[PDB]
């Protein structure tokens, strides 16, 4: 008889677990492989949770093939199709389907960051590397499900989620969401809006509306996420925040060159002064947040806004990205991002008049916060936002931009330099 899935995986080349296939033999995945869990999708298709001999765990879309026995599914094999069908139609797994899932067919691969377009209307995203058993990984499945359950719709419509039932949070193995082919992210559309403002093709009112819509979206998002509950920050939590933020400040002060570096070195005492007041913020509410929130995570098409990318903050250790944080963290991420959009327009656009752009920077931050506060109040969710955190967390956001610059793009130091120039009290 044909072996079971376990015997096929144990006998398969260890490169089975790799999306891009076998690599150089000198650094091959160590075998033998072991199948820890298997969701049978029918007709020779499956989702495996596979362990390599180094204890690393993997999500593997599998297909039985008479050529080699088993191999990793490729776009066009139909495994993503079969996952979608299992949504429309083993205790280790949780398959959650949402309204709108349909058994669409036809697969096309696309390169992101593995993602497979199905029926030219849905996107299946396979997790690849998983955390160790019982350890936290990406919270994207918990975020998307909480949003859908809360009636939040300003995101690609969820079709389904496949998770492994273990640990504090179910481990994400695959997500299926609506495909938005004609959608750009904010680093395209927000820059274009403000550029058009600078050219006089939009009025200030027109160029400010997206900032208000973003504020409403963020408030709707937080209200839905907060329905899963909240956790008061402890004294140790806020103390840890200050240590981390001061260390990042010290690194930026030690690495930023030139005039920007001199001004930052002169500003560091005041920034540190503000970080010091975090000790009085013990008890501030922590909720499930987006955690990596900025205009690049917002798709816009035909006046519809959609937030994506719920894996968490990529600079935190992988096992901390699911942790709850202050809602104000997302708030400052977006308001900082809006400021930066304005800085980029001025820096990149020939013959631009910075006066209207800088007026827009200030007015856009006010438009966002007003809409955010008004929407939270309309949703009776006012108390998740502790605005005492605005200044310390915003400063820390700008310091992160210095570190990005010195590590990846040196000239980018102008963004936090000009942002902080306008943020800091002009009394110093
Ligand atoms: Cl500027
Ligand atoms: Cl730039
Ligand atoms: Mg072989
Ligand atoms: Mg090999
Ligand atoms: Mg080796
Ligand atoms: Mg993103
Ligand atoms: Mg991400």
Architecture overview:
The PDB classes it as transferase. Keywords: Glucosamine kinase, transferase. The assembly is monomeric. The protein has about 425 residues and is α+β, with helices and mostly antiparallel strands. The chain is about 40% helix and about 20% strand. It contains eleven helices and 17 strands. The strands form four sheets. The protein has a six-stranded antiparallel β-sheet with strand order 5-10-11-8-7-6, with helices on both faces. Strands 1, 2, 3, 4 and 9 form a five-stranded antiparallel β-sheet that branches. Strand 6 and strand 7 form a beta hairpin. Helix 4 (about 185-200) crosses helix 9, helix 8 runs antiparallel to helix 9 and helix 8 packs across helix 10. One chloride ion binds near residues 343, 354, 358 and 418.
């Amino acid at each position: 008889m044909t072996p079971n899935w376990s015997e096929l995986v144990a006998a398969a080349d260890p490169a089975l677990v790799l999306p891009s296939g076998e690599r150089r033999a000198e650094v091959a995945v160590p075998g033998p492989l072991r199948l820890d869990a298997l969701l049978d999708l029918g007709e020779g298709h499956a989702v495996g949770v596979v362990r390599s001999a180094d204890a690393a765990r993997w999500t593997v879309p599998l297909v039985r093939d008479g050529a080699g026995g088993v191999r990793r599914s490729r776009p066009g094999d139909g495994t993503a199709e079969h996952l979608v069908a299992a949504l429309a139609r083993d205790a280790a797994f949780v398959l959650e389907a949402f309204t709108g899932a349909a058994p669409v067919t036809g697969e096309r691969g696309i390169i992101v960051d593995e993602s497979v377009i199905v029926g030219e209307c849905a996107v299946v995203k396979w997790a690849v590397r998983l955390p160790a058993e019982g350890e936290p990984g990406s919270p994207a499945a918990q975020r998307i499900a909480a949003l859908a359950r809360g009636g939040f719709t300003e995101m690609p419509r969820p079709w389904g989620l496949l998770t492994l039932a273990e640990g504090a949070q179910p481990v994400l193995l695959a997500s299926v969401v609506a495909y938005l082919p004609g959608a750009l992210d904010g680093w395209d559309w927000a820059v274009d809006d403000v550029r058009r403002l600078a050219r006089g093709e939009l009025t200030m009112d027109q160029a400010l509306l997206p900032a208000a819509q973003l504020g409403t979206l963020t408030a709707r998002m937080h209200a839905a996420l907060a329905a899963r509950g909240r956790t008061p920050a402890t004294a140790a939590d806020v103390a840890a925040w200050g240590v981390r933020m001061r260390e990042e400040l010290d690194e930026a002060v030690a690495s930023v060159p030139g005039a920007e570096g001199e001004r930052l070195k002169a500003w560091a005492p005041r920034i540190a002064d503000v970080y010091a007041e975090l000790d009085a913020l013990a008890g501030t509410p922590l909720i499930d947040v987006h955690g990596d929130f900025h205009v690049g995570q917002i798709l816009r098409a035909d006046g519809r806004y959609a937030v994506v990318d719920f894996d968490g903050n990529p600079v935190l250790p992988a096992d901390q990205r699911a942790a709850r944080q202050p809602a104000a963290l997302d708030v400052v991420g977006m308001t900082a991002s809006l400021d930066h959009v304005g800085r980029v327009v001025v820096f990149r656009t020939p013959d631009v008049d910075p006066a209207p752009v800088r007026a827009w920077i200030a007015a856009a931050q006010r438009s966002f916060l007003d809409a955010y506060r008004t929407t939270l109040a309309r949703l009776d969710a006012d108390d998740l936002f502790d605005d005492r955190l605005l200044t310390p967390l915003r400063y820390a956001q700008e310091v992160r931009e210095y570190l990005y610059a010195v590590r990846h793009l040196p000239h980018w130091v102008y963004v936090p330099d000009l942002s902080l120039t306008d943020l800091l009290p002009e009394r110093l």
